Amino acid sequence: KPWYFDAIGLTETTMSLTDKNTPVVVSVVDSGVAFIGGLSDSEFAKFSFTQDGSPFPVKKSEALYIHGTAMASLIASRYGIYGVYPHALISSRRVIPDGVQDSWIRAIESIMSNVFLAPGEEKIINISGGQKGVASASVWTELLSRMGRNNDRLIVAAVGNDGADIRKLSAQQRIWPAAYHPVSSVNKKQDPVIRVAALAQYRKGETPVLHGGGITGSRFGNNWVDIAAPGQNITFLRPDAKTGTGSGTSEATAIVSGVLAAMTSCNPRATATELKRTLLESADKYPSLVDKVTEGRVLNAEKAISMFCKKNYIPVRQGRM
């Protein structure tokens, strides 16, 4: 089993709280997923927002070929790699490389067209990356504000690697949708984005630190990062069925997405605000990580999933009165 399961508390008892019956589908907005090995039974749907039209990844770069499969395997792999929520299915929305104009936007707009009726189908949207060089930001903000007003979906967004202080970065160097900086009290409360930073390997109870390094180092900054989750020495699946090991905010985002998927199973009718407030309020708060993460939050999967599944126990499991 992987190290991060004990660190975030993905215990047998916690996982036993989740509802098997709930159709839970995570939206993996990435480079395409190869539904192979542990992901061979995980497909729900596949899409292409790329000029080539293929929903499958391409060998432009090894990083881009493996990216979508890696992310989906951390979320829901049933054997080989240990997915956070193996009962979840995956909806692959390939936006890169050779993406169409505003491929990221078109994929989120397709999610928001609500073709799938079940509340837990693409309620959680994993964006283990995103868009740099955003100058207008008008498109992103108008879409993300509508999503917060609709209050049904959550975007789990990587804050990016390069180890940079997001507060000191130029608007053009910041990754979207994570860079979304809601202004009004209304848009701050309705905010559907969960901005995820990467932590270095630790044991539950030990004070974690952000993952460093010039290349895979987590970006940081208070009021630009909502939560920090494991993002170092992470084993993931590759399309060739072999495994790889990696660090960074991509991994950390996929682990948060899996935790939220597990929560969703207990009541997918719960609003985005209900799930975001549970995940963040159940997060461990460290004094040492306050400058790096808003309120120095660290993913507690045991507290997030158990808090959420207990709150819904009487309305969902024991209605009879």
Binding site: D19, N21, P23, L117, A118, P119, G120, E121, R269, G319
Partner: protein, 114 residues
Amino acid sequence: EWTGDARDGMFSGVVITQFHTGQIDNKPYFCIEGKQSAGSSISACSMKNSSVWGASFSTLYNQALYFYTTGQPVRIYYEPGVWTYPPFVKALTSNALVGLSTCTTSTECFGPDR
């Protein structure tokens, strides 16, 4: 009477998408709406102590609220023309909810086929 009688209709592979609860003539009731896709939708109501299907109100309420929560595909068993108050029929439906089943596919569900 039986849920599996020929007269009663069915809709398989439906997601329960809407829920309403109220009261009429001292009887609580609930309504549900289920969709297979864009096409098509079905509405059905259960009323407490409103025969012939009144005895299943509590079981159907609990089960329908559960399936509304999960969003899993289900079979809705209904009987047309049961409710007769015209404003009620106009706003909601004449269909009584008479049963529910889990589904394996959009067409294959557990229980009787009628």
